[PDB]
């Protein structure tokens, strides 16, 4: 099914009434007045502006923000250096090295995320089998240098220790959809 957007060409004769209405519309700018009415009506509407940074835009638990590395409730790292996140990373933003820890544990010695390569796609956190790497809720981490956005393992673990309380609560809210 289709409709015409501009086929109103049922040409008809013109009375004095309609000719005068057409004349009034041209000479008195009536449709231009309707435009002013619309902008006037917005003048008296409450604006949609929020008072950033005292107010914030709404977000959801799924929001993909700054990365972090998480722990188990004991403090043990969750990451076991499987490299699934590194393999899937569409930007090759992740670089990992690992070796047996002093207690024999399978753990990383390098876990880097180039935040200026990363596309914030969340594929790493889907691929992680142990919920180790996550994108947290933080989006306010702009820096004054490029180098500050090349995160190493210490930075990423500090983000985890910094943001776990909110990260844990967001995972509790969404994990049944995953």
């Amino acid at each position: 099914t289709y409709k015409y957007v501009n086929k109103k060409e049922q040409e008809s004769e013109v009375d004095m009434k309609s000719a005068t209405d057409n004349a009034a519309r041209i000479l008195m700018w009536t449709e231009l007045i309707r435009g002013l009415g619309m902008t006037l009506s917005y003048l008296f509407r409450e604006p949609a502006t929020i008072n950033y940074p005292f107010e914030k835009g709404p977000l959801s638990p799924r929001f993909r923000g700054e990365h972090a590395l998480r722990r188990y409730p004991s403090g043990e790292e969750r990451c076991i250096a499987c490299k699934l996140c590194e393999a899937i990373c569409p930007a090759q933003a992740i670089t990992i090295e690992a070796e047996p820890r002093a207690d024999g544990s399978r753990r990383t010695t390098r876990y880097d995320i180039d935040m200026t390569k990363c596309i914030y796609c969340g594929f790493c956190q889907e691929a992680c089998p142990v919920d180790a790497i996550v994108e947290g809720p933080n989006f306010e981490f702009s820096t004054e240098t490029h180098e500050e956005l090349l995160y190493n393992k210490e930075k990423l673990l500090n983000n985890g220790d910094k943001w776990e309380a909110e990260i844990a609560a967001n995972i509790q809210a969404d994990y049944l959809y995953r």
């Binding site: 949609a48 502006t49 950033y52 835009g57 390569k117 989006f139 702009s142 490029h146 500050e148 956005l149």
Partner: protein
């Protein structure tokens, strides 16, 4: 310190405040990151309420917001319009592409970070950064300008 140093310091504050309060970015956007820049100008965030107004002429602009991917074919043109901004001028790198090449870092046709072409004051991460994340970076540029000490340094020369 002295009363001449105090007066110089208060003048630094005044000129700094003026440039903080009237930052005019160039109408300049490269790719998807520019869409979020539009959303910072849109009513919810209304950048104009902070004093931020786009002007199309580089001669009338203070900030360049590199909002998107910078290709090799585009690089000379971006350098040209940066050079044609009168000073003092600032650069905000917005998004992974501008920050360091992002998803296209390994391409034959892409500049791996606009900071190979122009100096950068603020790096805003994200792909794209949200309109709010960009606004945060703009407010971080303002605080950077608040820290400028050009008149104090002139006095001590």
């Amino acid at each position: 310190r002295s009363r001449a140093e105090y007066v110089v310091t208060k003048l630094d504050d005044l000129i700094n405040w003026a440039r903080r309060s009237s930052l005019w970015p160039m109408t300049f956007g490269l790719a998807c990151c520019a869409v979020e820049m539009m959303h910072m100008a849109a009513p919810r965030y209304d950048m104009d309420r902070f004093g931020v107004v786009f002007r199309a002429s580089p001669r009338q602009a203070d900030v360049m917001i590199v909002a998107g991917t910078l290709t090799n074919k585009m690089a000379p043109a971006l350098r040209k319009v940066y050079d044609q901004m009168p000073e003092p001028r600032y650069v905000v790198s917005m998004g992974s592409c501008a920050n360091g090449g992002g998803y296209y870092h390994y391409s034959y046709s892409v500049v791996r970070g606009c900071d190979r072409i122009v100096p950068v004051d603020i790096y805003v991460p994200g792909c794209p950064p949200t309109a709010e994340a960009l606004l945060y970076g703009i407010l971080q540029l303002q605080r950077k300008i608040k820290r400028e000490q050009k008149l104090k340094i002139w006095y001590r020369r």
